[PDB]
Amino acid sequence: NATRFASVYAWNRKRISNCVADYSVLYNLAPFFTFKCYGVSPTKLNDLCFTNVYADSFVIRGDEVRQIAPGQTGNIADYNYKLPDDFTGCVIAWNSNKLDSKVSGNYNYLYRLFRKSNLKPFERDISTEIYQAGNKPCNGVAGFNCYFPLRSYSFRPTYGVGHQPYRVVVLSFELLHAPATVCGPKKSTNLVKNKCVNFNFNGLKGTGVLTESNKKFLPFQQFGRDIADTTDAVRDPQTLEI
Amino acid sequence: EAEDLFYQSSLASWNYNTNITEENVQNMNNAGDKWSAFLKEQSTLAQMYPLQEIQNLTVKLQLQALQQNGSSVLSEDKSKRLNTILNTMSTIYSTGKVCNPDNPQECLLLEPGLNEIMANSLDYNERLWAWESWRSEVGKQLRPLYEEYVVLKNEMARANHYEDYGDYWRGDYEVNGVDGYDYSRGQLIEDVEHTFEEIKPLYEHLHAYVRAKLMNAYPSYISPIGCLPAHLLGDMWGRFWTNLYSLTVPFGQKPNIDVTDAMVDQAWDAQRIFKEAEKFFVSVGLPNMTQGFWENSMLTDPGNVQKAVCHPTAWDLGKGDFRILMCTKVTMDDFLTAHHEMGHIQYDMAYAAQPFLLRNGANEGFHEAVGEIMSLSAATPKHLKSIGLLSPDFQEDNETEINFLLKQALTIVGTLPFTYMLEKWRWMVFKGEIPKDQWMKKWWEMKREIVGVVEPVPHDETYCDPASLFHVSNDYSFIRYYTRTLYQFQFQEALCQAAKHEGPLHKCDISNSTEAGQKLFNMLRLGKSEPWTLALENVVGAKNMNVRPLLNYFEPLFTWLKDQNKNSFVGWSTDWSPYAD
Questions:
Q1: Using CA atoms, how far apart are residues B411 and B414, in angstroms rounded to an integer?
Q2: Shortest CA distance to B450 belongs to which of B428, B422, B492?
Q3: Which of A138, A182, B57, B491 could cross-link to A143 by cystine, CB 3.0-4.6 Å?
Q4: Which residues of A are less than 8 Å from B297 in CB distance?
Q5: Among B323, B577, B570, which residue's Cα sits nearest to residue B458?
Q6: B237 is in an annotated binding site
Q7: Does the annotation place B481 within a ligand binding site?
């Protein structure tokens, strides 16, 4: 929900690490236009955690939304950015008609259509180099047989869907050998007392009868044991009650 | 950089066509000079291109449209002179005042005046002043204007390595660089002459059918043997013969096929016109509707406080923006041009990933011939019964299909010798084959032999007769209309060959079939990256221009035109004249 976005070749970095992500108000509410991705489903992210998550904020044309795919090549997927074959995360797009544009075309943000070579995935390429495919040079100026790929956008809300301003948030999921830090939301149920019931806690599994406890407890502990090495107290995962 | 400077210019023309104010005429100019500066700051940097070493065909098709220097090869006073005479010759056609020489106290204007007098007038002498005074008051000063114009464009063509200016309109059809699919610039001359020989019995049976039914209206004005007087063709020149349908109706007791009476009682609007007709495109296999087409286009004339020109055109603005502009009315003919003008805009929807030099048709007539195949497939009884607009049990016999065939005979087949008569004349005035005293004498001599029309008043060299049209007075191409029909019948045959319909081609229907979608969409997405001689082989299988589906379209008509003209005279002669008294 950013007010200012970055360019499509000037991708910024916002770290998502050591936190809990709540997708019950973002993905389940869904204020965006389209919701589709490959690799994983959006109903699989609630019980799956990863090590390091990255994201960005950039607005493309509407015809360039088909180039954002793993293994895709084209005018944007081979010259502006690249998605790798092992891309785990998902891509969410939403139209941004009147707030991200201006009158007579949004000439604030630019995009590169030609590059001198094929780029790697995660390349923040903001250079002003010239693609060459001829014989003679031009001494570094936009002149004879020398392309100038830097040209601004033309966003305005009275236009069609072919270059409608679509705010695309490419959220990149990545699992490593480090343990996971960012995990999705998960609903909870009510608690019952004075009954032999099953326990599915955050860090304790078993069965028994939950009664009131008059024992001392710590705010960081999960469970307690007696002298006979069995569980006799559990702290609430949502709250704190032993 | 051409996706921004032309896009600022062409949106000002869309803003001028929507809102006509005094601040909007200059809005096209100040955003329009930067595209004309970019058209010359790129073309002077594209003159030293080595075309002897580039092997890429996708690059070299882009550089052929950039190597053309344009109209600024010559000197500074002549580049001022071409900017001077071009806006002069279009202002006098738009603001031309013509009236009767007997009573000049009332003189009206162009568009409400001349249009009504060719529709329902039956008088001989009163309609004769409507055709003669337009050629005697507007076209008198064109002969000092066109004589220096015909020497201006010949010097533009010799420095750009052409033969003459007749090869400039044929330069868009030139295909070079591919072995086996070569097409010379002079190959279009003998191709037009070869395609006319199959339609020469087709027009001669149409020439005898019009004159035999017009014997009852004009007993002592039209000969049974000779040619046609020029002031009774139902049009200003003879391009559209649709207004002569009330005089050449085959059976008046048979009802016409129309949904004008069926559209009023269901309370249809202009929003329901483009919504039901968009279901024709998704059922074939084309992609869906864009949202900028709906909430931003002008289908309803916005009140009487502001003027807006709503002539039907599809505005290919740029970068994937698609807009249409017409005043949609509740009739039969406005629904067919709603099918036609969005057939151009779905052709432009296919090559959205192609660049600016490849975002065009394969020639100058490819963009309009691919739009009429949905308009021909919308007036069929198979489509109109499936949408529920007609009767659920409507009678269809052999006699009511002739009345549908004459709706496609008058406006399509009738302009094709008139397209041949003008474009052979325009090719030979720039080549210098005729002198100044034979400049206008050759025009009605070639008119009397190939279309069968004789002027009732003799015109000297001080009048300019073919420049009263819209395309001659604005310096546009006229060879696009001859291959407009030949491409729209080769497409409409070959698309519903895969739709497994057994019957005639006028009863064929490409909807409710996805076999014609994938056979079309790989041809629509090519654009100028592939030439037309290889894109034709993917659909119809023929790289050459042939007249085979045009003979099979009117094959019930060519049987009936043979049997009705057993007593009539086939052909014409160069002896009869209306002024020979």
A1: 6
A2: B422
A3: A138
A4: none
A5: B577
A6: no
A7: yes
